[PDB]
Symmetry: C2
Subunit: 141 residues, 2 copies
Amino acid sequence: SLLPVPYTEAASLSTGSTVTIKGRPLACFLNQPYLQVDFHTEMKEESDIVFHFQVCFGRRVVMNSREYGAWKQQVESKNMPFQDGQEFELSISVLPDKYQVMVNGQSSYTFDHRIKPEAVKMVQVWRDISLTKFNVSYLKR
Amino acid sequence: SLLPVPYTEAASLSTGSTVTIKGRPLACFLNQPYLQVDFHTEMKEESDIVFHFQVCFGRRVVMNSREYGAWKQQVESKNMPFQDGQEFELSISVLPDKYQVMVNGQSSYTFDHRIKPEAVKMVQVWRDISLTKFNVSYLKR
């Protein structure tokens, strides 16, 4: 639709930052479209990932980090608040101890900080979605 | 790039038909972009799939069919002729007994017919690729 996918934006994060993502899957759940949000330590797409968030719509969600080029301990969830064929509003909040992922206003996943959020320099949103809004909040000291 | 992805084209297949697909992954292999080619029995994207071909670039290839809404016996391959960061030329030939998948001119995968290729009405190419050429050959009786 509006914002080009894969979508990449330079970014900085700290306690109190929020990343808001509004979009829609590009296929019905039967075809298992994916959505991936990666918080990167550099603009380079092969850089390390502080928070890796991958939805296989209708199936599962995987969360992990990639440190010095290697994937670490994968966290896997079957919680699936996303609705087949529907627009979704995704909200990732940086709390002192973890990321909190709200889906359509509902707390759905958390991921404890493995690397300080201040290490993030870029956010990329990609795979099988269209994107209508992307925002990183910059209101706190 | 040029052809919109997800790419859908009404199609008919029989022995001697070839599907040619030229494209490029949207991310380096470290980020595991996907490519999926589905030969559908109807234009509806939730319709059955006669030949499902899914590349996880740099990792594996999965082939299957989806019959009356259910996935059947998955075939899995570690053969990975695709090259990191490179354009690829994909050629799926309809032989009497199977599909033969050429990658950059090199025979790479085959998949025995589970449903007659004459059941195909649509081809969809999607996931993490850009597309520059798509062609279905229509030269044989």
